[PDB]
Design a protein around this nucleic acid. Sequence first.
DNA 1: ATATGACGCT
DNA 2: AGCGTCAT
Length: 430
Amino acid sequence: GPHMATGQDRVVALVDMDCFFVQVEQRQNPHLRNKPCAVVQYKSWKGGGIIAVSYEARAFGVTRSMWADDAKKLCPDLLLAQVRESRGKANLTKYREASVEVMEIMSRFAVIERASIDEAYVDLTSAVQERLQKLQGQPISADLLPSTYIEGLPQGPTVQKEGMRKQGLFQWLDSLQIDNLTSPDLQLTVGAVIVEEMRAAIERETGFQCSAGISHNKVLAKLACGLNKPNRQTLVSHGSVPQLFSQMPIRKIRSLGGKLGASVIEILGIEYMGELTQFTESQLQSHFGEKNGSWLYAMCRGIEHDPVKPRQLPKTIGCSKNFPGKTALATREQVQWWLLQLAQELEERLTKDRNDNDRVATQLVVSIRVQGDKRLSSLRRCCALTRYDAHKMSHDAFTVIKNCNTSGIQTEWSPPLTMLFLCATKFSAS
DNA sequence: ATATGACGCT
DNA sequence: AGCGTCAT
Ligand SMILES: Nc1ncnc2c1ncn2[C@H]1C[C@H](O)[C@@H](COP(=O)(O)NP(=O)(O)OP(=O)(O)O)O1
Ligand SMILES: [Mg+2]
Ligand SMILES: [Mg+2]
């Protein structure tokens, strides 16, 4: 009873940039600001594949994955910006550099774990402690929280959204024990105040807006972040979890969006995260394994222990390209040439990495996909990465995959290759 | 015919 | 080591 931990030990935030590639293009080109807008790669097939969408465009039903020509049928005024193309492939440098701007600002507040090109987790537990002693039991003003939502509030005994926001925040603050420095809810509130500040600094210094989740672990933080996007932050407290989870589809929780999530639904005959509570940990372990069962048992009670790993930099650097359908590489010369293109971008990125971050990759991984295999990768092999030299790197990769070629003729390659992928890995200090 | 990155399993 | 899962 007093021995049951509640997963309330930490304050953890997840910050995610609003329509990130779109914002990067909109900052560069004022003409695209406050417009239905999308970022697109490869204008040649159906106008390009959409990979990011402004919220004005979303309101017309434009989504990621969609072809640009089809997006124009839903939204004829849609403005587009194209991904840089270098060496015959998509080049994401602009967005990687924009990402670094954001991560450096967040780094100033606390230790971040970079989770994607546009998001990081933040462990606020220490910052909240320090901010709490400087505050000295002084009540927290709703003015310190001008973009914050308290999930599940307002409740009990207004028409438009900002009215509802404030009402819920007033209820939350009015209930707040500012007397006890170790109250979990109080810790979350102070965490929210800091994330208000962090998000203001990001906007001020970059022009980019973002949303945030503030809770006790990574999973709740990521879930909370999405609940009030764009340009808003959401606090999910321990106590909000039962109602929140009671109608929350299983697939919405991080790691349960694929096969395992589907098997939980299937095997257990449930739909919502909260329904998991009626199962014993041993029952869950028997159906899904020791670690999965353990993790589900605690998670459906809002408890999770994945720590925020102190890592602002990626652990691999990679370049890939699909060669779909009729463009699938079918000769030795095409394979070699495209491996050189990939190796050339890779080298440019590794040398920049070695100078910026005082480390060097030591292993090269080569990955291909062949026509008809619908796996991401058909095959992976590796070799030593000794020199940041594109010509050597591509030669080495060709060497380690050449024998996949099932062809009779010298100059032909079969089966045709639908993807090439070079990944530098196993970094070491230098 | 939609470019990446992290991590688990064996 | 090489493959399978899940993610943006
Ligand atoms: N399948 C994919 N292929 C290529 N790039 C992608 C991608 N998914 C995302 N990106 C790139 C482009 C994206 O801009 C960026 C961040 O991805 P999100 O945070 O999942 N989506 P956004 O930040 O745009 O919208 P909001 O967060 O407001 O919902 O990563
Ligand atoms: Mg985002
Ligand atoms: Mg994101």
